[PDB]
């Protein structure tokens, strides 16, 4: 009753959140100096870290 089981889903979600906080920091560092009407919201994010 004091021991909980985590399946593949919960651990995959944990890893996905670990990647999401990193790409959030990335887009925060990118948006801190970005101006208006220069790009579409595609280069702000990256796919290699996740």
């Amino acid at each position: 009753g004091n021991r909980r089981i985590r399946s593949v889903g919960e651990m995959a979600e944990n890893q996905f959140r670990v990647g999401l906080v990193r790409v959030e920091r990335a887009v925060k560092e990118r948006l801190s100096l970005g101006d208006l009407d220069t790009l579409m919201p595609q280069d702000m994010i990256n796919a290699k870290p996740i």
Binding site: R25, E29, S32, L33
Partner: protein
């Protein structure tokens, strides 16, 4: 007096660390307490001759020593921005900066 305090940071992106530190200064309009970055990585080879032109425009240790009259809130600011690996100096964490003679030395390094 706006002293020149030396700080080490997460290297590699040191120029971008300096720009982010500047953005954090201008966010809270901290230019009262603070100055500029002084990253004189300015060994300025331009041998743009035949067969090779990629010259090393940058050479200096990864220190971005910033002019500022120090306050503990200022210390926690310069530590609040990421990539601030070491705020070096002999202290617990509230150090004394380099003297003015090394300010002249870094002026020489900038001019060169």
């Amino acid at each position: 007096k706006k002293r020149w305090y030396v700080v080490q940071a997460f290297s590699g992106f040191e120029g971008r660390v300096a720009t982010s530190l500047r953005e954090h200064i201008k966010l809270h309009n901290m230019e009262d307490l603070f100055g500029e970055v002084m990253v004189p990585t300015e060994e300025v080879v331009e041998i743009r001759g035949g067969q090779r032109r990629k010259s090393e425009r940058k050479f200096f240790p990864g220190y971005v020593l910033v002019q500022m009259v120090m306050n503990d809130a200022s210390w926690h600011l310069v530590r609040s921005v990421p990539r601030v690996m070491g705020f070096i100096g002999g202290t617990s964490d509230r150090p004394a900066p380099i003297s003015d003679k090394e300010v002249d030395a870094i002026m020489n390094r900038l001019q060169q």
